[PDB]
Design a protein around this motif. Structure first.
Motif, mmCIF file in Angstrom:
data_model
loop_
_atom_site.group_PDB
_atom_site.id
_atom_site.type_symbol
_atom_site.label_atom_id
_atom_site.label_comp_id
_atom_site.label_asym_id
_atom_site.label_seq_id
_atom_site.Cartn_x
_atom_site.Cartn_y
_atom_site.Cartn_z
ATOM 1 N N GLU A 174 -7.324 19.191 -26.210
ATOM 2 C CA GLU A 174 -7.763 18.911 -27.568
ATOM 3 C C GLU A 174 -7.433 19.985 -28.578
ATOM 4 O OE1 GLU A 174 -11.606 17.269 -27.828
ATOM 5 O OE2 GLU A 174 -10.487 16.096 -29.264
ATOM 6 N N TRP A 175 -7.742 21.220 -28.229
ATOM 7 C CA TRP A 175 -7.687 22.337 -29.140
ATOM 8 C C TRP A 175 -6.802 23.411 -28.534
ATOM 9 C CZ3 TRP A 175 -9.190 20.673 -33.533
ATOM 10 C CH2 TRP A 175 -10.272 19.791 -33.655
ATOM 11 N N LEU A 176 -6.388 24.329 -29.391
ATOM 12 C CA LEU A 176 -5.767 25.571 -28.974
ATOM 13 C C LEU A 176 -6.548 26.712 -29.601
ATOM 14 C CD1 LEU A 176 -3.130 26.989 -27.662
ATOM 15 C CD2 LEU A 176 -2.478 27.191 -30.080
ATOM 16 N N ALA A 177 -7.029 27.626 -28.769
ATOM 17 C CA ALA A 177 -7.712 28.821 -29.238
ATOM 18 C C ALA A 177 -6.738 29.991 -29.244
ATOM 19 C CB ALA A 177 -8.920 29.144 -28.359
ATOM 20 N N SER A 178 -6.823 30.819 -30.283
ATOM 21 C CA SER A 178 -6.025 32.033 -30.382
ATOM 22 C C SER A 178 -6.922 33.216 -30.721
ATOM 23 C CB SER A 178 -4.929 31.904 -31.449
ATOM 24 O OG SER A 178 -5.492 31.751 -32.742
ATOM 25 N N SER A 179 -6.623 34.367 -30.128
ATOM 26 C CA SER A 179 -7.322 35.611 -30.420
ATOM 27 C C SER A 179 -6.362 36.582 -31.093
ATOM 28 C CB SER A 179 -7.911 36.240 -29.153
ATOM 29 O OG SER A 179 -6.926 36.432 -28.155
ATOM 30 N N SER A 180 -6.891 37.430 -31.977
ATOM 31 C CA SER A 180 -6.050 38.386 -32.691
ATOM 32 C C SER A 180 -6.663 39.777 -32.650
ATOM 33 C CB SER A 180 -5.808 37.972 -34.145
ATOM 34 O OG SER A 180 -5.131 38.998 -34.854
ATOM 35 N N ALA A 181 -5.825 40.774 -32.948
ATOM 36 C CA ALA A 181 -6.293 42.136 -33.178
ATOM 37 C C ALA A 181 -7.086 42.288 -34.469
ATOM 38 C CB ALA A 181 -5.109 43.103 -33.189
ATOM 39 N N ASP A 182 -7.208 41.234 -35.283
ATOM 40 C CA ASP A 182 -8.040 41.260 -36.480
ATOM 41 C C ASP A 182 -9.479 40.843 -36.198
ATOM 42 O OD1 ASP A 182 -7.979 38.479 -36.238
ATOM 43 O OD2 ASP A 182 -6.457 38.216 -37.789
ATOM 44 N N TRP B 136 -7.313 25.689 -33.470
ATOM 45 C CA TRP B 136 -6.334 24.809 -34.092
ATOM 46 C C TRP B 136 -6.230 23.495 -33.326
ATOM 47 C CZ3 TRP B 136 -3.544 27.901 -37.859
ATOM 48 C CH2 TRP B 136 -3.706 29.281 -37.691
ATOM 49 N N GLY B 137 -5.778 22.461 -34.033
ATOM 50 C CA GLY B 137 -5.504 21.184 -33.392
ATOM 51 C C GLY B 137 -4.229 21.239 -32.565
ATOM 52 N N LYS C 256 -3.235 21.600 -37.100
ATOM 53 C CA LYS C 256 -4.129 21.777 -38.232
ATOM 54 C C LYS C 256 -5.183 22.821 -37.905
ATOM 55 N N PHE C 257 -5.308 23.817 -38.779
ATOM 56 C CA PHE C 257 -6.353 24.816 -38.616
ATOM 57 C C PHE C 257 -7.714 24.143 -38.706
ATOM 58 C CE2 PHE C 257 -9.588 27.359 -40.651
ATOM 59 C CZ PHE C 257 -9.634 28.489 -39.869
ATOM 60 N N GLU C 258 -8.556 24.341 -37.689
ATOM 61 C CA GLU C 258 -9.890 23.753 -37.723
ATOM 62 C C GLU C 258 -10.973 24.793 -38.005
ATOM 63 O OE1 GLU C 258 -10.179 20.397 -37.288
ATOM 64 O OE2 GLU C 258 -12.295 19.958 -36.835
ATOM 65 N N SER D 220 -8.500 40.937 -27.001
ATOM 66 C CA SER D 220 -7.328 40.922 -26.139
ATOM 67 C C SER D 220 -7.134 39.611 -25.389
ATOM 68 C CB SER D 220 -7.396 42.073 -25.123
ATOM 69 O OG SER D 220 -7.211 43.327 -25.761
ATOM 70 N N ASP D 221 -8.162 38.770 -25.275
ATOM 71 C CA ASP D 221 -8.023 37.560 -24.477
ATOM 72 C C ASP D 221 -9.128 36.571 -24.825
ATOM 73 O OD1 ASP D 221 -6.738 35.904 -22.734
ATOM 74 O OD2 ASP D 221 -7.354 36.939 -20.901
ATOM 75 N N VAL D 222 -8.824 35.285 -24.626
ATOM 76 C CA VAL D 222 -9.767 34.184 -24.780
ATOM 77 C C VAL D 222 -9.623 33.270 -23.573
ATOM 78 C CG1 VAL D 222 -10.011 34.152 -27.281
ATOM 79 C CG2 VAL D 222 -8.088 32.959 -26.214
ATOM 80 N N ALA D 223 -10.710 32.577 -23.249
ATOM 81 C CA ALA D 223 -10.683 31.621 -22.154
ATOM 82 C C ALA D 223 -11.688 30.516 -22.437
ATOM 83 C CB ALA D 223 -10.982 32.298 -20.812
ATOM 84 N N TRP D 224 -11.350 29.302 -22.017
ATOM 85 C CA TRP D 224 -12.199 28.148 -22.258
ATOM 86 C C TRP D 224 -13.079 27.828 -21.059
ATOM 87 C CZ3 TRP D 224 -12.226 25.011 -26.744
ATOM 88 C CH2 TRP D 224 -11.213 25.272 -27.675
ATOM 89 N N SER D 225 -14.259 27.298 -21.355
ATOM 90 C CA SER D 225 -15.017 26.546 -20.375
ATOM 91 C C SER D 225 -14.185 25.360 -19.879
ATOM 92 C CB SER D 225 -16.333 26.066 -20.983
ATOM 93 O OG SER D 225 -17.346 25.982 -20.004
#
Lengths: 300, 10
Positions: free
Chosen positions: A29-37, A43-44, A49-51, A62-67
């Protein structure tokens, strides 16, 4: 097939610093992104599309992970903490405190009742999702931990570190089951069937190992990887590929069995630090560092 | 820290 048909469809802009990781939602469904900010961005997956934006960390992530059920996110930050967020509300559900340095990698287990974490403190930590309490602290390595990953049923953990080792631990007891040994091992992860392990080393090399036998089965070359911990992925939706980023601003795709380079995707303007493959469609998400800071979606 | 060269620059 012999060669995929990956073409760029979307370029996502929004992050103001280097992007560190991109992960597709398990429900595709979604894409998660992590940043140094210090930001996560949802996002879709099919329209780019930015959600929404998720904020809370005091330093870079440094990292993200989904349930598994795509309802929770976990974040590893330089503020020495991890954070469990509710994706829909965007509110921080819990803050995992315990590491004494930068937390580099994180992952849920399939049950999504545990979270594994690696940090610059050279330890691997297993946390309980419900309470946020630290269940186990394994003295995993002698140097910063680059990647942590659960196996297909959550019974095993694999860990890599700049000390040049990869290690398989039993989740229930925390005891080290296997060690393969030296250039810094920058990434590690299980194969979909849990029989293999993909490990990247800082000598421009990927290697698919069979840890059961403790033997290297395949070796993938041609790309550039000497400095950064770049994510690698098994692409399973269409042809069986190995996809990775590279320090020459390319996305490399090898055929898993032939190990021959089947495609090199052009577009990013800096080191492509993270790639992710869609769980159902032939969609690749790529993320690069500063000078670029954008996420690119590719379809095949 | 994944986006930096801290360990390589040492």
């Amino acid at each position: 097939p012999v060669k995929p048909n990956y073409a760029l469809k979307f370029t996502l802009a929004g992050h103001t610093k280097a992007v560190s990781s991109v992960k597709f939602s398990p429900n595709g469904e979604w894409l998660a992104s992590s940043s140094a900010d210090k930001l996560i961005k949802i996002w879709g997956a099919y329209d780019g599309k930015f959600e929404k934006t998720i904020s809370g960390h005091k330093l870079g992530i440094s990292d993200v992970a989904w349930s598994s059920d795509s309802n929770l996110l976990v974040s590893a930050s330089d503020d020495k903490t991890l954070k469990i967020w509710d994706v829909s509300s965007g509110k921080c559900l819990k803050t995992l405190k315990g590491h004494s340095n930068y937390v580099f990698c994180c992952n849920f287990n399939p049950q999504s009742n545990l979270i594994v974490s690696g940090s610059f403190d050279e330890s691997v930590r297993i946390w309980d999702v419900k309470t946020g309490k630290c269940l186990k602290t394994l003295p995993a390595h002698s140097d910063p931990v680059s990647a942590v990953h659960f196996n297909r049923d959550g019974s095993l953990i694999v860990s890599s570190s700049y000390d040049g080792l990869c290690r398989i631990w039993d989740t229930a007891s925390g005891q080290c089951l296997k060690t393969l040994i030296n250039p810094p091992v920058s990434f590690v992860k299980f194969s979909p069937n849990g029989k293999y392990i993909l490990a990247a080393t800082l000598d421009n090399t990927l290697k698919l190992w069979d840890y059961s036998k403790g033997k290297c089965l395949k070796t993938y070359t041609g790309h550039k990887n000497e400095k950064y911990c770049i994510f690698a992925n098994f692409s399973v939706t269409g042809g069986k590929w190995i996809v990775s980023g590279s320090e020459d601003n390319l996305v490399y795709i090898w055929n898993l069995q032939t190990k021959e380079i089947v495609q090199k995707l052009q577009g990013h303007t800096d080191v492509v630090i993270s790639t992710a493959c869609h769980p159902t469609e032939n969609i690749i998400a790529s993320a690069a560092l500063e000078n670029d800071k954008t996420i690119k979606l590719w379809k095949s | 820290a994944r986006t930096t060269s801290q360990l390589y620059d040492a």
